[PDB]
Paper text:
Hydroxynitrile lyase from Hevea brasiliensis (HbHNL) and the esterase SABP2 from Nicotiana tabacum share the α/β-hydrolase fold, a Ser–His–Asp catalytic triad and 44% sequence identity, yet catalyze different reactions. To investigate how regions beyond the active site influence catalytic efficiency and active-site geometry, we engineered HbHNL variants with increasing numbers of substitutions to match SABP2. Variant HNL16 has all amino acids within 6.5 Å of the active site identical to SABP2, HNL40 those within 10 Å and HNL71 those within 14 Å. HNL16 exhibited poor esterase activity, whereas both HNL40 and HNL71 showed efficient esterase catalysis, demonstrating that residues beyond the immediate active site are critical for functional conversion.
Variant HNL40 introduces 40 changes to HbHNL to increase its sequence identity with SABP2 to 59%. Thus, HNL40 contains a total of 40 amino-acid changes relative to HbHNL: 38 amino-acid substitutions and two inserted amino acids. The kcat value for HNL40 (74 min−1) is 300-fold higher than that for HbHNL and only approximately twofold lower than SABP2. Thus, the 40 changes introduced to create HNL40 appear to have restored the oxyanion-hole and catalytic atom positions to be more similar to those in SABP2, but not identical. The l-proline originated from the crystallization solution, which contained 0.2 Ml-proline, and mimics a bound carboxylate product of an esterase reaction. In the HNL40 structure containing the bound proline, the hydrogen-bond pattern with the catalytic serine differs because the catalytic serine Oγ adopts a different conformation. The new tunnel to the right appears near the insertion site (after residue Pro126) of two amino acids in HNL40. The secondary structure of the main chain in this region changes from a loop to a helix for the two inserted residues (Ala127-Glu128) and the two subsequent residues Asn129-Trp130.
Numbering used by the authors: 1 to 258
The structure:
């Protein structure tokens, strides 16, 4: 077995706490694991209204990677919206990335604008699917930004539907306001082929994700073919909680390969 340094990156409205089952298992196998709160997430002291762009939302990840000592590489693991953050990170620090794992995540490309897969996602996602999610607007650095805050039924039905009530309760207690920064992402420079396009990419898709359905995950793969693909059967959106052991086995193979 090869020793790797995994950096686990949560998705919208969530935090490092999402990784609380997987991180100890990876460490027991002997790896180094970092689980970050993105800006205004988890117990990060900022609120979403102070965040003016996806790059600021990603600041803890970029800051962590800037402090990596020379020669150290990491394996990024991003879940859901976290796939966007690891694109931003790879484009500034690709020399520090052994590989990027996309766990039922958004997988942007270099050909179209960074918000491309988020645009496609919204065109194929019925608006009814958001249930009691609350949407809101704020202004930052002169820009109007639309945020969202997952509600209890959305969480129950779309993200946690295969989780026990003890994990679901943690979500009701801990989810915070977030944003996709979609109009900010529309005016952003594309992801570069030299940076983000260079790093090796693994996609792990889930067969019961009712937040990002498998057909959309598969479309993303077709749109931007990654170096390796894995399938986790029986994983809901929160597959690091319902299929923890499966994912750890996959990440061991990745670390053994890259
Ligand atoms: O990042 C996440 O977890 C959210 C869930 C639905 C769409 N993306």
């Amino acid at each position: 077995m090869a020793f790797a340094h995994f950096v686990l990156v949560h998705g919208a409205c969530h935090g490092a706490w999402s990784w609380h089952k997987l991180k100890p298992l990876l460490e027991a196998l002997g790896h180094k694991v970092t689980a970050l709160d993105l800006a205004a997430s988890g117990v990060d002291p900022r609120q979403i209204e102070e965040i003016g762009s996806f790059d600021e939302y990603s600041e803890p990840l970029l800051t962590f990677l800037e402090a990596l000592p020379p020669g150290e590489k990491v394996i990024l693991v991003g879940h859901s919206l976290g796939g966007m953050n690891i694109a931003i990170a790879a484009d500034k620090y690709c020399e520090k990335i052994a590989a990027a794992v996309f766990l039922a995540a958004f997988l942007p490309d270099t050909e179209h604008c960074p918000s491309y897969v988020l645009d496609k996602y919204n065109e194929v996602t019925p608006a009814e699917n958001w249930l009691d999610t609350t949407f809101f607007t704020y202004t930052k650095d002169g820009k109007e930004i639309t945020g969202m805050f997952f509600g209890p039924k959305f969480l129950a039905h779309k993200l946690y539907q295969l989780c026990g009530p003890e994990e679901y309760e943690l979500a009701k207690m801990l989810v915070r306001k977030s944003s996709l920064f979609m109009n900010i992402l529309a005016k952003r420079p594309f992801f570069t082929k030299e940076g983000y396009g260079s790093i090796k990419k693994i996609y792990v898709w889930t067969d019961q994700d009712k937040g990002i359905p498998p057909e959309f995950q598969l479309w993303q793969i077709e749109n931007y073919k990654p170096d390796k693909v894995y399938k986790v059967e029986g994983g809901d959106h929160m597959a690091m909680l319902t299929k923890t052991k499966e994912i750890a086995e996959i990440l061991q193979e990745v670390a053994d390969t890259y």
